[PDB]
Design a protein around this ligand. Structure first.
Ligand SMILES: [Zn+2]
Ligand SMILES: [Zn+2]
Ligand SMILES: [Zn+2]
Ligand SMILES: [Zn+2]
Lengths: 285, 291
């Protein structure tokens, strides 16, 4: 008949961390004291949207909205990065600037400790929702050390005085290198692309492992947000065989292969027309 | 059975290049000259430029057929680029309102708008020379719409040449134009978001299509009804259905899909055509959409 364990593990992840970065929240230096707080509050928002039920307009529910908000946060990250870059290139163009070289250090003192508390505690031992907040936390950890160490030279030998530019540069660059991966991941998720953890051809062999299947076309198997996969394909079997028990055994095999979320099978007839099935011939791969 | 590219590129890539140099002119008149009002349409021209860009981009993608990792072609990358361009519009409007409210609170500036007027005067004249299916009309309506916006920027600045008394025509006009453009963004982004989360198309109705299902001799009971569209107008269908053992299930779904095609166009569709086991009270995982 084809028919709150791990998501609930996330309630104790940010609801506290939100208040923590809130307490965390020089006047211009306190600017990024909220870029993390807002992001993680929106992450919790995404969690509550994952809690939502299905509907008619949204038959599957309100799930991918989580990735939507995630990528929105990532775009705001893209934003704040370029902001810092503008500051750095301008202050390169304006190499003159005066401020005590430790007043920012002494407040980055708690910051490096502030960030690392929430960052690596949020480290894994696998919803990307958590990971998106983590790489942000891991991201602003760079902001914690972008000026802390890079200003000590000014405090010690200001004959260079511009180590903050290069350190900000490299840290923002590494944040972006962190982004690119999950960026392309989220893309192919929303791009209706099959999940990374799966091998289309592998699933094909899983199918063909049954005596019943003689051919399969119009196969489509993509996933929801994280581990919720949807399956569709056509199949022709021996006309002598009972599709019902056949398809039941098929679904049995697909389940015993690995997890599923939703499966549809056309169960076509052997009849069928290969020479012009080219419309769904095969994925070019 | 379960079922020009050059000119397509050229007449649209070249047209986008015409819009590009349009932007180029209105922006070389833009920054150093005045820096106050003219930049308003700049984005609008630029955002429509990017719209044409991403449409031809999507054609370029469609030139690549689907693959193993991509079962449905590079279509939805259209929406990706669309929403990204939307966010660019949002950030440019944001910096615009930022500087505008700053100049409002900080009146410390001065402008000889006249020399900045004529560089923006022929700009709307350039909007005049650039003038079917109710879409080209909608584009002509868009064109007419662009005028109302573009023509408004001058008439504001003109009396100021005679009336230095107020001088505040630029902030308010920039503000209202930002409102119009952000409202357009709101509309289109609501549309595209509802499209995402694998939403059903607005042009169609779940209840209507499921009634079309239930209105056939074969059907006895359906469930798992999951239907939606890809990017713009290509819809996909998935659902289960049980009926009597006597029915020739194959021809049943055959005629079902036939009547569905008859109802309207689809891109893909699958049906499981389930059995009269029917664990109805335990089908709560597939009982109905909450609506
Ligand atoms: Zn079922
Ligand atoms: Zn075929
Ligand atoms: Zn087929
Ligand atoms: Zn059920």
């Amino acid at each position: 008949h084809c028919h709150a364990n791990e998501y609930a593990y996330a309630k104790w992840k940010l609801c506290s961390a939100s208040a923590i970065c809130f307490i965390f929240m020089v006047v211009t230096d306190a600017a990024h004291l909220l870029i993390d707080l807002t992001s993680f509050l929106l992450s919790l928002f995404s969690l509550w949207l994952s809690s939502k039920p299905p509907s008619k307009r949204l038959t599957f529910g309100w799930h991918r909205a989580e990735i939507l908000g995630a990528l929105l946060s990532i775009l705001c990250i893209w934003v704040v990065t370029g902001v810092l870059v503008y500051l750095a290139c301008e202050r390169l163009l304006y190499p003159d600037y005066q401020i005590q070289a430790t007043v920012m250090i002494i407040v980055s003192s708690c910051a490096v400790a502030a960030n690392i508390v929430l960052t690596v505690v949020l480290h894994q031992r696998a919803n990307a929702s958590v990971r998106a907040a983590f790489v942000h936390a891991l991201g602003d950890l760079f902001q914690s050390i972008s000026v802390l160490i890079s200003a000590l030279i000014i405090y010690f030998k200001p004959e260079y005085k511009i180590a903050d530019p290069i350190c900000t540069f490299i840290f923002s660059i590494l944040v972006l290198a962190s982004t690119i991966t999950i960026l392309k991941d989220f893309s192919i998720l929303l791009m209706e692309g099959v999940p990374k953890s799966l091998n289309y051809s592998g699933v094909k062999e899983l199918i063909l492992a049954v005596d019943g299947v003689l051919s399969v076309h119009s196969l489509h198997i993509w996933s929801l947000t994280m581990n919720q996969v949807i399956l569709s394909a056509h199949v022709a079997t021996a006309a002598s065989r009972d599709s019902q028990v056949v398809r039941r055994e098929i679904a049995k095999a697909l389940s015993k292969s690995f997890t599923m979320h939703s499966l549809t099978i056309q169960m076509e007839s052997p009849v069928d027309q290969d020479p012009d099935c080219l419309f769904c011939e095969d994925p070019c791969d």
